[model samples]
Each structure stands twice: as structure tokens, then as C-alpha cells.
Target: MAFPELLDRVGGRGRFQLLQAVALVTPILWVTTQSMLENFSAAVPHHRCWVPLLDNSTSQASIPGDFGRDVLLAVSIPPGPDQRPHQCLRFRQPQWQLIESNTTATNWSDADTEPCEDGWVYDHSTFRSTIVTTWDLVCDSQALRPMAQSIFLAGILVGAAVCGHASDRFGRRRVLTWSYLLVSVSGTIAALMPTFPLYCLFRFLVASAVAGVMMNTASLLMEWTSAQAGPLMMTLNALGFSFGQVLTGSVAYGVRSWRMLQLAVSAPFFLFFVYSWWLPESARWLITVGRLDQSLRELQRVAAVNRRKAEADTLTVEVLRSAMQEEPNGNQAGARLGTLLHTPGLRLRTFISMLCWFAFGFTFFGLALDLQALGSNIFLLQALIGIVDLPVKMGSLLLLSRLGRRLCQASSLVLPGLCILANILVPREMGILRSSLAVLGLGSLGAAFTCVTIFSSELFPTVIRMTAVGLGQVAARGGAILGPLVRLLGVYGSWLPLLVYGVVPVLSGLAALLL
Candidate 1:
């Protein structure tokens, strides 16, 4: 008398369930979009020290008032090792002015440089507005720029555990409703924050609320759908996320302002809030929490929506009460975190899951967020890159069912690892070829991650499954937080980041053998 059978009786696989899945996944779509939003929002376009206009007389040298900006830069800014103009430093006085005045240069090539005292000027050819431009997060402040993304990921790490418990304890519908409100309010507030620190604070708050939205939506959909439909359900979730990922590039390309991007990403959740009343509370959760009457009512509503009136009438209070009585003793809620390691094979499974997820998180997001590393035209590249995800998602049911989960998961990782590693061997002169390999690698990682999502859930025992999965997701978040940090390794060597991204997943893919 498990809830799956009960769900089947009420047309769980019918149109009503599909509609519920659609509703639940809408938030997931936006959740995935936040990654791209942050990617484009904090992006630093090309920039250099801002040059101040000076009157010809005020000018130390008698340089012409008609001198071009480029000539001014040539006289003030020096070239870096790359032969490009130095972005952060500028000469204290215009060299051409000093030379024309015939004053023996107090400071020459050997000395005298200053940071952008007048502030920096950005090349807005690519970006209309970004955090780097809006907040002047260039020069010395540039290092702190990634913190926006890091802090948001940190919020997810902490928020996942907090919100997971809150949703389960309080009720999914109630928690999700409140989360929608918080996401909208906090995200809107983030856009209005006058300072970077305040913006980060509100962004963290938005991430916290989004954590609840992401967690509960998946649980709600799973509880409402049939067991046989579980893999396809997950594929649908992946599909929603992929579409959002693609749409994010388009949105970012269309709206180049960071504040507007923040507003755009946040506003959709308000619609979810308005639509929240239509989404049902989880019947499975209600049964576990001993809310039989409420659970039955929800199920009947679902039946009515799906036009399964006969099935709905069959679900009386007595039938539900009997099913509740038949529930397993093992599922009586005594499982604890300590029990995850106390069991025999369970510990091995838990260990493998945590490591694979960590590796998966790092590689998948590292490739995603670091699109510029592969090449230029980032917005279009990101959109095109999303095509890689479609094959894995559309083929997931057949692939996982026929090839089996473990093989599909491992092969997905292994093939992608090779693709990424091959780029290391290929010369950078072949930019198009390198970009092609990187996209393929990204797609493979996407496939691997999709399989891992389904496989991890099945590997754990029913009683402690939630705890194990929670821990695994937290581990993945840890890796995700590190992914951006990994992208920064490019400063050390352009090839280093790719090497790290490639190596970790290959090792983790090998680790899947134990599972």
C-alpha cells in the first residue's frame, strides 16, 4: 500500500500529473538561470585607466587640444607583457606633455606609476552594464568580483540543509509559497542596493530562498508522479534547466544591464507565487506526517483534475486510513545521519556518491561558468553549447534503461574527460577546433550529471535516503563553489584550469567502478 500504488489509482501518470510537473519545474528553470545571470552580470569587459580631459594650457606639455584619446593613452599608459595597454596603471604625468615642455622627466620608464586615480573607463562594446562597470570593481577590487558568485553558492550550501528540513517539517506548499515571496523581494532588493556589499547580502538572501524553491519543487514532483515515470520526470527537469540555460544567454544578450538582469531573473518567481495556490501539497509527505484527511483531499482534487472521478470516489477516508496503517515500520522516521555510515555497503555507496557528485559539480559548472576560457562571442557560444544537453536529456530514458545507470554515468564522464583532455594537446591556434572539443566535453559532463541525479537517488536505502542525498548535494555545492575559483587558475596558466577540470572528473569516473 505504498503511495506509488495509491498515486497510480488516482491517475498519477495522466494529464494532471504532467501539469503538476510543469508547474513544479518552472521555478527550477529560473533557479538554473541564476547561474548564467551571475556569469553575465559580474562579467568584466575590457577596460583601462580613465583619462581626464585637460585644457591645452593646463596641460604640462603643450600637447594639442585636438589629440586623440588613443594618443593620450599612448602618452600616459604603458603596455603589459602582452603588448596590450596596461589596464590598471598609468603614468603620473603625460609623457608627451612632459617631453614637449622639455622638463627633465622626474619619473620615466624606470619608475612612477599610479592606479586609476581618475577611475577606469570600460570598453562597452560587449557589455552594456555589469557589476564590474556599475560598482567600479576593477583594478584592486577586481579580485573581489568573483565573491558575488561564491557568496551565492555559499548561500545554497547553507540554505539547502535549512530549507530542506523546513519544507519537510512545515509543509512543501507553505514553505514553497513563502520562498517565492522571499526570492522576489530579496532579488529585487539586490538590484536596488547602493553598495556592492549590500548587493551581495541581498543576493545571498535570494539564494537562500531559491534553495527552498529548488529542493521542494523536485520533491513535490516526485511525490506526485508514478515510479515508472521517475527517469522521464528527471529528464523533464533537466530539459527545463537546459531551456533556462539557453534562454539566459538570450536574455543577457538582450538586456545587458546587471540590475535589469537581476530584476528579470527575480520577477518570474512572483508569478510562481501567484500560481502557488494551484499547486497541491505533497500527498506522500502528508501520509508520512500523519495528515490522512488532508492527503486524501489533495489526491481527490488531483483525480478530479485528471478526470478520474471513479478513481477519486474509490479513495475514501477508510481506504486511506487502511493504507496509512499498512505503511512499513522501517519508514517510521528513526533514521539519523549516523546511520549512513553505520551500515555496511551503505557507507561505500555514500562515499562514492559524495566524491562523484563533488567531481561532477566542479567539472560541470566549471565548464559552464567559464565560457570565455574556450573563446569569444560568449552569449552565442553559451546558447549553442546548450545543444549538447539535448541529446542526453532526450535519450536519457532509453540510454539509462538499456545501457544501465552505472555504465551510462561512467561512460558519460569518461568520454567528456577525454574530450576536455584532448584540448590540452591541441594547439590554441586552432580556436574553432578547441571550442568544438570544449562544447562536446561540456555536453558529456551534462549527460553524466543527468545520469548521476537519477542513479544517486536509487542507490540509497529508503529510510536514510533523504539524509544521504542531502549530504551528497552539499558536497556537490562545495565543488560548485570551487568551480569558479578553479576558473581563476587561468592566471597561473591558461591550460591549468582545463587540466584540473579534466583530471578530477576522469578520476571520479574511474571511482564509479566501486558503485
Candidate 2:
């Protein structure tokens, strides 16, 4: 018998299992908060160039009664193509005559205008404060907004490599414990930083910690639970993340200040760190390292919690040793990146898994991070995306079992690609239709995420599973890091980003068939 049988002998899927799963899954809820936090923290509100002369004027007494702030703005700032006051440029000298004349008919292209040297005036009705507003990231500095998210994802890329190896070398529980503490400290510090660069730096650290939490929590839960229960636990954690996304929207609505919102989302990890001591080390990891005695003890502790005391007393190091004898030798301790390519079969699986992950991240975040383009209330959309995932993932659980991993994975990716690409035929004026298609694509992508997580875990051996998962994450984060940058292609053509996002997943779904 393998180690899974040993787990069953000790009381599989029992009381201890449920409690442990909850503990591990609770932390996952906040992972999405950190990942998607920028939707609120960096939100850009309506803005216009600040004309200091008009803004600081103590008296409208110089102007006629009809010439209020509205007229002042009309004369001071040029209108964009949308006919709203321009975001970047302001009149060098107030065009007082333009307000009185037929402004729309007047050719103002030749009018003297300059950049908003005085800074910008933001509409605070939507977001009281955001990174964009706090740092004045509009106009010339607007590029930094997406760059911040890229930097955070880059940190996640690095964290996956570092934490994946560290968990395998050290242990999941140890790395996860430190990850919680690091997220707490770094996230809080990022929230408090006065400078934009400092905030980005600490946010990077928080991102890395969050990556570690995510990787280890998945591996740890899978290792502790039985095979039959593994998918359920993974799905449960995905549900938690979905719920977190919804909760993030509500919390962000309540806390409009970016710093306060950042702080509120991050501070809870300290509590997770505090309580994480109660979590057990992966007994499977212990057995792989040949620590039979400790592994047996951990199992017995689980058995005791499960009220299988008689069964617990019957288990011993000898039984554990015999059960796990078929496991990989402890001598192969250092599983490196090269190991993934060391064998033909392993290489193919690793490559395909990486591709699927990359596509998932690229497509998912491409839509998720660019909610502003959806031309809807961002908070409502964010929550709606979260709400959409609930039923999709629950249904995914059923399909994953019924149709099996390969078909489900392929279909999930393909369906989303089709949904996203369908928008190309829809007119832009069909705002509801466009939004619905995007949401439907995202919802399907969520199911693909669930399938990939469970599928990838099953593909590799225990010895290098964490390393393989990390490498997949490296690919995914690479895709995530580039997702926003790809949106920049919209400047070339509005259809370009959508085309890239849609096509890549369809190709990836075809790749899933090979696996």
C-alpha cells in the first residue's frame, strides 16, 4: 500500500481533516485580495488639468453671474474627443471668448495649450483616494499605474521559484509560516509608505509572500488529505479566493482611502501567521525525508483529533516505513529545474502544464485588471465576477469528476476563448453585451484555473511536485506580468488586445489535448 492507504488507516477525511482544510483555506481568501487589490487601490477616477488661477480664485466676482465654476472650467480647459474637459492639457490663457462663442464649431486645434503643470484635479466621488490620485499618476505618469501591478506580479514570479524550492528543501509548513509573517509586515509597510517607489517596493515583497502562501497552501492541503478528498479541498480553496474577490469589492467600497484599504486587507495575515503554528507539517514530506518516527507521530496526532485513538495506537514507524517504501528515495533530495527536463515524459508534461498556466494567467488577468475598459461600475463588476465564479467552480467540481481532467481542462479554456472572441463581432455600443461576454469568458477561465490546479498536482511525483508547480507558476506569473503590457497594444488597434487574449487560450486549449 502507498502512503494514501496509510492516511486512510489513520482516519481519512475525518474531523481533523476538515478543521485543517479550513485553517489552510482561510488564508487563501486573502490571497485574491492581494492579487486583485489594485482594482481599488490604484483605481483612476475622472480627472482634469488643474488651472491654479481659476481654482484658487477667491471670488467669482470678476465674472458675470452665469460665469460660474462651470464656465471657468469651459474656458480654462480644452474638451477631449468625448467632449469632456481634457485630462492633460489646459489653456495657456483662458479662452474667455470660447465660452461665449460656438465652442464646438470653433477650431481650437491651433489654440495655445500646455501640460497641466499645476497638477490635476480629481473627481473624488468614486474613489476618495487611489494610488493614481495619491501620487498624481494621471497624464504623464499614468504608465506607472499598470507598471506597479507588473512589478507585483514579477515578485510573484520570483517568489514561486524561491518559495517552491524552499518548501521542498525546508518544508511546506515552515515556508508558509514565514510567508504569512512576511505578507503581514511587508503589506502593512507598503500601505504606510509615503513615497510611490517605497510603496511599490514593499508591495513587491507582499506579492512574493503571497505567492509562497498560495503555493504551499495548495501543496500542504493536497498532501494532508486523501486523494479522493484532494480535489474537494482544492475547489474549496478556489471558492474561498472567489469569495475574497467579492469581499475585496465590498471592503474597498467601505474603505475608499487606498492606504486604509491596503492596510485592512494586509493586516489579517498577521493573525494567520499567529495561528499557523497549530498547522502540522506534511507527513508525506516527513516520510519522503525518511523521518519515520516524526511522520508516525504527526499521523497519530491526526488520528487522535479524528477520535481514532485505537487506530492511532496501532500505527507505528514500521508500518509507515513499509507503506511509503514505494516512495522516491530520500537520496534524491535536491530536485532542481533540470529534473523537469531530465526525462522525456516529465519534460512533455512540464512544458504543456507551463503553457496552459501561462495562457490562463495571461487571459484571466488581461480581462480582470482592465475593468476600467468595461465601461461599468468597477465595484459592481468586480463583485459580479466573484459571484459568477461561485456557480461556475461548483459546477466545475461536478464536471471534473464526471468528464475527467483532460476534457474539462480543454473545454474550459476553449469555451472562454470563444466567448472572448465573440465580442469582436459585437458593436461597442452594446455595452451590456460586451460586459456579459467578458464576464462569461472570465467565469469559464475560473473553471480552467480549478482544473489546472488539481490536474497539475496529479501529474508529478511527490519528490518534485512543488518544484514543478512553482515552475508552472513562474510561467503563469510571467504571463500575468505581461498581461497589462499586452493591453498597451490597444493603442495600435482597439481589437488587438482582445484578439491576443482570445486566441492564446484557444491555442492553449488545443495544447491541453496533448496532455
Candidate 3:
């Protein structure tokens, strides 16, 4: 019998599987939170140049008139087109005449103004402290904010490559254990870093470890469970991430300080690291590596847990070897990336899947990371977006079963693209309508991610599936790395980033139709 048949004999989809899946999936909740943590931790609050006359009490009193603080601010700071004080520029000298005179009649276009030499003051109403305020990442340094997220995503790209191979060589359980420890230590250290450079370094390490955890978690779950249970496991994992997004908003709301919030999210990994010791190694992996005895031990233990002790007693190394006879040879080398391109059929599927993965990652993170631009309460928006995923994912599952993979995949990607592009036509003042469209787009993208995960796996044969999937992951990560950087395009035109985000996915969705 094949592994799934053997898995049935050992009580597949039983209590043992449930417990193990829960244990593996729990950590995933925090993983999503960590990925989106930058939204709050690096949030750019409303800010304007700090004027000494308004800020310093002694100077404020030294002014001739007994002006209120608001009057002092009116004289000191210049208003921009939005009627808010200019963020970067302040009058070189107090424009006191404009304070008492009719402000609309006077033309202050040629008024002498200078950059914030005295630094900026941030609004504390929403975010008390953020990386933007701590290191002054505003004004000219604003680009660095998105650059931080890009670097972190780049680390995820590197991690996916390294951890995917390391898990295969070192075994899933071992690598997953180390990854948990690394995330905890690195993330905690990142919270404590005194400088932005050091913080980014540790954040990179945290991102890398997080990738390892994610890849290995899926590998272990897939290896242990029957093929029939795959969808359930995947749904559970996706739900865990959605819930994590909700948790991130709630936690960020309670813990406004970025360091404390970072610490709060990182500290839980230590617990995951501890419990990860109990997770069994993949029996299939051990068997492929010729560790029949160890593999039998693991299988027997699982059977015992599922209350199939009598059936497990009959399972010996000899039985396992014969059962898995059709399995790939232990010493046989695995397929390479080049193998994916050698065949025309495989090449087309691989190329299409890569584009789909790239579009998914690019658009997903692009919308996710720029939550502040929605012109709504970001904390509420985060929760709302997270909340919307549950129904969308559940609904996608129905469509996946009814409509089939290719159709579901195409619509999931294409619909989100259309939704995002439609936002371009909406008036900027229509915050409610724009945010609703964004939420819908983001939620559907979550479904696209889930669909592609299953679709991409089914596209390639078992021998080359790992390689093909790894290629897709690399493409996705590459897209994610660019997602935040693409937001910088808004400087050229406010709609440029959305244009790219919307168009690429639609094109990729069209390509997915070929698969």
C-alpha cells in the first residue's frame, strides 16, 4: 500500500492528527502578526516642524502679545494646501502680521521658510512612539521606512532558499526547532536594539527564521497527514494567519510602544520552541533517507497515539520497506531546478505558476503594508481586513470544490485586480468607499494565496514538486521584496503604485488560465 493507505491503517484524520496539526498551526498565528507588525511599529503619525517659539515656554512668554499656544503656532508654522501645518518647512521668522490680519487676503508664497532645523513634533494621539519618531524617519528620511520592510522581505527570500534545503538535509523537526529559537532570540534582540541599523539586522534574522518556521510547518503537516486531509490543514493554517492579523491589531492597540509590541510578539516563540521538541520527525522523509528503523518507530508511535496499537505492532521495518517499495529510491538524487525547464509541458506550467505566485506576493504585501493610506483608523482597518479574510477564504473553499482549481485561481486573482484598479476611479475624498474596495481586494488576495498553494503543488509531479514549489516561493518572495519599494512610486504619481499592483495580477491571472 502507498503512504496514504498505510496512514489510513494507522487511524488517519484521528485525534493524533488533530493535536499535531493544532500544535504546528498555533505558531502560524503569531507569524502573520509579525509579518504585519511593521504597520504599527513603523507607523508615520501626523507631524510638523517644531518651532522654538511655540515649543519653548520661556520663548512663548517672551512674545509681545499674550497669545494662546494656537496663536503662537499660527504665527510660527506655515500651512500647506491641505490646511494642515507644513510637515517639513517652517517660517524663518514668525509671520505675526498674518495672525491678526485676514489670512486669506495675504499672499505668503514668497515667504522665507526653512527645513525643520529644530526637528519635528509628532502627533501622539494615535501612535505614542514609532520607529518614525524614534529615529526621525520623516521628511527626507521617509523612504527609509518602506526600505526597512523591503529588507525584511529580502531576508524572507533568503530564508526560504536556505531553510527549504536545510530542512531536507537536517530533517523537518530539527530545522523547525532551531527556527523557533532563532525567531525568539532575534526578534527579542531586535526589540532592544538602540540603533536603526542594529534593529534592521536583527529584524532580518527574525524574518529569515520566520520563513523557516512557515516552510517546515507545512512540510511536516503534509508529510504526516493523509492526502484527503490536505485542504483542511491548509484552511486551518490560513485561518490561523487571518486570526493573527486580528490579534496584531488588538495587541498593537493595547501596546502603543513599538518596542513593547515587538517584544510581546517575539516572546511567544520561546514557548513554541519548547513544545516543538515533542513534534515527531517525518516518517516518509526518514524512510527515503534509509532510516527504516527510526521511521518505523515514529509510525508506531503515531499509531499508538491514534489507538491503533494492535495494527502498529504488525508494522516493522520489513513491512515498511515493502509498503513503500514504489517510493523514490533512498540514495537516488532529487530533481533539480534545471529539471523543471527541461520539458515543454513542465516549463509552461512552471512559468505560469511563477507569475501567479509573483503577482500574489506583490499585490498582497503592497496593499497590506500601506494600510495607513486608506485614510481610515489603521487599527480598525487592520482588524476589518483580517476579519474579512475568514468568510472570503471559506467562500473560496466552496468555489474551489465547485468551480475547480483553474477557474477559482483565475477569478481570485483577476477579481482582486479589478477591485484594486477600480479604486483609482473613486474620488480620494471617498475614504469609506476606497477603504471598502481595498479591504475586498486584500481579502480576495488572501484567497488567491491559498488557492495557488494547492494549485502549484498539483501542477508538478512528486519528484519535481519540491523544486517547482521552491521556485514559486522564490518568485513570491522576490515580489514581496519589491512590494514596499513599489510604494515609493507614489512620489511620481499617487496612482502609479496601485496601477502596477492592479495590472500585474490581472496579467498573471490571465496567464493562470493557460494552466
Candidate 4:
């Protein structure tokens, strides 16, 4: 009997499997919120040159309009096309009566601008504070702002490799439990860190732990489910993942402070830690490792809960022995990580899959974290982006059934790339068209992401599947880290970010054809 057959004999579609799926998927909500915390936490809100308290000498008459022009806005700060003060520059000295008209009289082309001297006065109407606002992460330090998100991604990258290996060597239940515990402790501690660097340290720890739990949860749940139901179970988890994105938007709206939002997202992991005690180990892993005795014990419990324990042939030592012998590789518990690249077709598949993963992460997060770039209501735009995932998720299922995986995967990449490229050509003044294209691009990326995960999972074998996924995720994290750096290019040329986002996916889509 196959692993799935064993699962069926035990308690495949019973209440036990349903409860296990629910328990395993509980963290999906937190995953979205934590993974995208940078969307709100490090968000660069509207800001302008600091308006210092003007002395009497600067403005003797003190007329309301005169003070606004002469003392409030230093001549060093140039106005943008919208006639608002520049975000990252200011004047060394006040522009007095020569610009007192307050009618945009100051010729920006002639005025000498300086780096922001007195920091900035941020618009706090919507957000009380953010990482950018709290740390003055603008002007010269602006480039470093995205690194915070990059640091989080770097942690995930490291964790994916380390935890994937550890999870396979150890068991999913222990690894997941420790992950929840560590994330709660580290994230909460990071929330209370006094300095930015120290804060990032703890966040890194949290990311590593979260990555481990995320990879294993899917593996564990799928192993417990029937092969036919695995996709449906995974689909339901994606459903929760979308809702989780919306939940983050709602939470961020209510709790605008970055510190508070961090705390809110991290605190939920404590609940996950408590539930980990009851989490069952993956029985399939036991079978693969030659621990048939332990596996049979768990299988018996599953059968009992599934109300098939009394069936004589529901589970037997002889059947499990025959299943083990049926494996051409006999026992793969000793399979080393090196075996992945050492194999032939598997190596090529791994390479292509990782490249696709990198492309997905680069664009998926680049678009998600930069909702401000698309020129839409930030809160509503995020919610709508989350909503867009639902249709794509449903549509992917239909396409996957008909067109098959590679073609479906290939088209998703090309479609999103086209959408991003179109956004670049569209006039910026056409905000609606530009914004719509960006969101359309995001939706397409979301659908492609679903396909890539399904395809990658099917491409690898059971022995090292998690390891393969982990390695691919490391590549994804590299892309995610690059995402912010790409956005930085927007400063030099507004079209650069979109241009790169457009090109990467198109190239990766071509690579998907080889898969």
C-alpha cells in the first residue's frame, strides 16, 4: 500500500484529518501578517521639510501667510510637480521677503537645495508613526529603509535551509513547536527593543522560526491527507492566507503605530505554541525512516479516531512491511541532502524551480510592499490586492485541471509581466490606468505563485521534498531582498522598478517552458 492508502485505512477524510488540517493551518493568518509587516511598519508616509520655530528676527511682522512663506518653508526645499515641498531636502537659511508672496514664487531651479538638516515633519493624520518616521529613514538614510525588510527576508532565507534540514532529521512536530515558541519569544522581545539594529536582530530570529513552521506545516498536512484531497486541503489554506492579508489591512488601520502593530502580529504566536503540544507527528515520515513500530502505533490511533480500529485489515504490520519493500530505494531515511543535486533530471528541475521561485518572490513582494507606488488608497489597495487572490486562486484550479501545470504556470508569469510592462508605458497622469495595471500585475503574480508552489511540490520526491522547497525558498528570499533595492531605482527613474519587474518574470516564464 502507498502512504496515501495507509492514510485512508487509518482515518483519511474523517474528523481527525479535518481537525489536523485546521490545527496545521492556524498559523497561515500570522504568516501573511508577519511576512508583510514591512508594508505598514516601514511604510514611508508623506513628509516635508521641518518647519522650525521661527525667531522674531526671521519674521518681524508675523502675518499668517507671511510667516507660512518666509519662516515655515525654508527656500532650500524645492517643491515637487504638485507644488509640495520636496521630501528629502531643505534650505540652510529661510527665504524671507523675496518669497513672501506664498504663491510658488520661489524659483526652485535657481534656489540651492541642501540635504534635510532639521529632519522632517511627517504627515501623521493616518499613521501615528512608522519605522521611516521614527528613525528619520529619509534623505540620505532612505536607502537603508528597505534593508529592514531585506533583513527579515535574509533571516527567512537562512531559516529555510537550516530548518528544512532539521525538520527532516528531526520530526515536524518538534520542529514546529520550537518554531512557534521561538517566534513568540523573539518577536515579542524584538517588539520591545530600544534600538533599530537590536529590533532587527529579534525580527530575524522570528523570521527564521516562522519559515520553519510554514514549510513543515504544509508537508505535514499533505502527508496526513489522501492524495486526491491534498490539493483541496492546500486550497483551503490559501483561502485562509488571503483572509490573513485582509486581516493585516484591518489591523493596520486600527493600530497605526508600527510598534503596536508589530506586537499585535507577534503575540498570536503564543497561541500557536500552546497548540503545538497537541500536534501529531507525520506518520509518513516514520514509515520512510524505518520506524514501522512507531508509525504503526500512530496509525492505530488514527484508525481508532477514524472509527476503523475494529476493521481487521484497516492497518497491519505485514501490509506496512510490504509497502516498505515496494520502494525501489528500500529505506530512504538515510537520504542525504547532496542527493538532490547529485541526481540528473531532479537537478535541472530544482534549478528551474528555484529560478521561478525567485522571480515570483521578487515581483510578488515588490508589488505588495510598494502599494504606495501604484497611486491608490493604501489601505483599500492592500485589501483589494488580497481580494484579488481569491479569483486567481479559483481560476488557477480550473486552468490546472485543463491546461496542466507547466503551461498554466508559464502563462501566469507572462500575463503578470505584460501587465507590469503596460504600467510602465501608461502615462503617470492616468493614475487610474496605471494603478489598475499594477493591481492587475499583482493579481497575476498571485495566481502564478499558487501554480509555482503546486508545481515545485510535485516535481520533487518525498525523501527530500521539504529540503528542495527550502532551497527554492532561499532563492525566493534572494529575490525578495532584491525587491527593495529595485524599488530604490525608482528614485533615479520612476520607470526602472516597473521595467525590472516586467523583465524578470518574462525571462522566468521562458525558463518555465523548459520545465
User: Could you estimate the TM-score for every candidate?
Assistant: 0.90, 0.90, 0.94, 0.87
- Candidate 1 TM-score, true structure as reference: 0.90
Ten-residue region with minimum lDDT total, candidate 4: 51-60
- Error at 146, model 3, angstroms: 1.5
What is the clash count of model 2? 0
**lDDT scores of the candidates, listed in order:** 0.78, 0.83, 0.85, 0.78
Clashes of each: 0, 0, 0, 1
Give lDDT: candidate 4, residue 324.
76
How do the residues 419-504 of candidate 4 rate in per-residue lDDT, one tens digit apiece?
A: 88998778778887778877778876777766777777677877777668757766887888888777788778888888988999
- How many pairs in model 1 have backbone atoms within 3 A of each other, for residues 3 or more apart or on separate chains, i.e. clashes? 0
Question: Would you give me the overall lDDT of model 1?
Answer: 0.78
lDDT of 1 at 312: 81
Candidate 2, residue 88: the lDDT equals 86
Clashes by residue pair, model 4: 76-91
Best by lDDT: 3
List the candidate 1 regions with Cα displacement exceeding 4 Å. 53-62, 65-68, 97-110, 329-336, 342-344, 396-406, 457-466
Residues 147-186 of candidate 2: C-alpha lDDT, one tens digit per residue: 8888988888788778978998898898999999999999
Q: For candidate 3, write residues 1-515 as lDDT tens digits.
A: 66666788988888998999889988988998899999989988888898888787888678887778777777777777688777888888777688666557357765488888888898898778999899999878989977899989988878877998898788999999999999999998999889999999889999999999999998888778887888888789889988899988899888999999999999999999888888778888887778888888888888989888998888766767776685855343444677788888788888888898899888888878988887668888899888999999898877877777669878988899999999999988878888899889888788888878878777788777767877887888898888888888888888899899899999998878888
Which model is ahead, 2 or 3, in terms of lDDT?
Answer: 3
Q: Candidate 2: where are CA atoms >4 Å away?
A: 59-66, 102-105, 290-293, 320-326, 330-353, 397-410, 454-471, 510-515
Off by over 4 Å in 4: 1-5, 54-71, 74-77, 100-114, 287-294, 312-354, 401-406, 456-471
